[model samples]
Target: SMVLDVAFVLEGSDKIGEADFNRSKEFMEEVIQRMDVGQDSIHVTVLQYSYMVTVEYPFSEAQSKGDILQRLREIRYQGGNRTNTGLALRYLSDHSFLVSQGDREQAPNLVYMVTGNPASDEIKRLPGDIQVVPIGVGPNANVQELERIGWPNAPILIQDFETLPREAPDLVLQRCCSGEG
Candidate 1:
């Protein structure tokens, strides 16, 4: 059985340009389009952020593939003073994966952080039991800073969000379909 929990920890600070934000939206929709999403398959969560994290929805409400895409279309870019990837990620298991947020206790948990710059708030320690996939979007998203935290695969670095190859998603897709991502 292919069961998975996907969370997107997107960057949303002063560094993200309006055009980049739009491209990011399209990129996420592309990922969802390929997933075999449903109540029984893959569940998704979107935690977009600036310095503060905002939970778009949780697994309980993200079971439908089309609904996640529709939500992506409407997800506005919330600008903030700066980026706090550390705190934003902390919000994942502490809040987003909490039982109240509809977490599946044993499903393989994955986080895809799409960012254009290195977060001002990096972490000394990573959260436990979660495999992070960093989708570095541009020049400022340093590979050295982005890759260490990611496991099983190096960061998926891209020149720009819109140009992410069809193969980009498949990296994570394969991981998810075959025991991880």
Candidate 2:
């Protein structure tokens, strides 16, 4: 079985919009259901951010697909005026992906940050091996900022949240599966 660590961080500002956030969560449900989650297969974590960050769940705590998906449904919005993508990045780099938090250092690791606005601060450096996938949501999402934070792989941009119900599963799977395991 493959070993992997993945974190899905979301921008929880009002800019994400209620409907948009819901669609995004639905997309995540599809993605989680498709992944082969287990202690040795894949481990997932979730975080929500606005001006502040909330570690909704840690990697070690979510070793099963059923538990992870159930937690996804429970994530609520943490609305704020600013989209502090940079701070969120730094927090996860220091905390979420650490071995102490159940990160498998030898396993391929990935971080996906979903946002609808430009980052308010300069993004801090990420661990060299973690593949960062930035998902730009709606037209207002900052494409340039996403490019700065994401790995070299083309960033995924969703112009309309409404379409995510039909398109997001494929996009999530494609990005998550790109890692070597």
Candidate 3:
């Protein structure tokens, strides 16, 4: 079975520099590496952000580790006004995340990793089918706001930088392949 997991990553690099951007890129790479997506089984799309939003990769066939790694490394740093989390969420909730919703054959999931100072926004407009999982990193981490965006139903969680790969791997697997087996 094929699965599509689209993610909108609002990074905190605006608070720091290129190093944080690289760290965010590495974080995304680590996530896909630990997931259960095999060749021909998964489709992944990544959107990265700092001061502005960037759609790094649209939803596409993720048939190999090289594809995923290649895209991650290709993301250049653009520390642009602040993290416009609301706009990013709205863009994803409307576009990339919803691309495969009605496709009965493909397992669908959406994951969001937000690393920055918690900016206030309204996220109720997000679709129910898109599950959002957010990890707040560094100082000023705010899990409560994340929950409000789509918590419990969407499961917005906070994790330290070190535990992200370990803690988030299951959430991605469970969301993408839970009923398959």
Candidate 4:
């Protein structure tokens, strides 16, 4: 089994329609269902943010897929118009990726950011070893910015949030588990 540390940074702003929000949850459920969650397999963390960031669930906290899915469904949408993406990214890198937090130094670190709004703050650049996969949820998402943030992996641009479950999971699995930095 591969040691994989995966973090999902989701958008919780009102800009994300209720239907879209539900789709995002569905996408998460699919990912969790497909992943092998355990010490030697994949460890996951989730964070949702608008103007403020909240760690919906941390890697060390979830013992199984059910725990993560339940918490993901319970996440309430947040307020404030600003999309503080940079802050969220920084938090994931500085805090969520810590060894003390269950991250393995030799493992493949993957960060999947799902958002519908253009960021208010400049997106922070991640370390070269980390794989950043950005998902642009709707028309409002800045593809150029997401592409810039993701670098080598092209941003996954969907027509709407509902399209995410249909399209993103397979690509994400391939990128996250392929053992490519």
lDDT of 1: 0.76
Best by lDDT: 4
For the record, the alpha-carbon RMSD of candidate 1 to the native fold, in angstroms, is 2.5
> How many clashes would you count in candidate 2?
0
* TM-score to native of every candidate shown: 0.88, 0.91, 0.75, 0.90
Candidate with more favorable, higher TM-score: 3 or 4: 4
Estimate the Cα RMSD of every predicted model relative to the unseen true structure: 2.5, 2.3, 3.8, 2.6
Across 30-57, the per-residue lDDT of candidate 3 in tens digits comes to 6677555555566566777655668777
Query: Each candidate's lDDT (Cα)?
Result: 0.76, 0.78, 0.61, 0.80
lDDT of 4 at 137: 82
Per model, state how many residue pairs clash: 1, 0, 1, 0
Error of 4 at 53 (Å): 0.8
Question: How big is the positional error of residue 110 in model 4, measured in Å on the Cα after superposition?
Answer: 0.2
Query: Distance (Å) between predicted and true CA of 150, model 4?
Result: 0.6
Candidate 4: segments with Cα more than 4 A from true spot? 178-181
Q: On a 0 to 1 TM-score scale, where does candidate 4 land against the true structure?
A: 0.90
Error of 3 at 77 (Å): 2.4
TM-score computed on alpha carbons, candidate 2? 0.91
Clash count, candidate 3:
1
User: Across residues 48-154, which tens digit of lDDT does each residue of candidate 4 receive?
Assistant: 88888899888779557777778877776665677888889888888888888877888778888899989999875687677788999878999888988899778
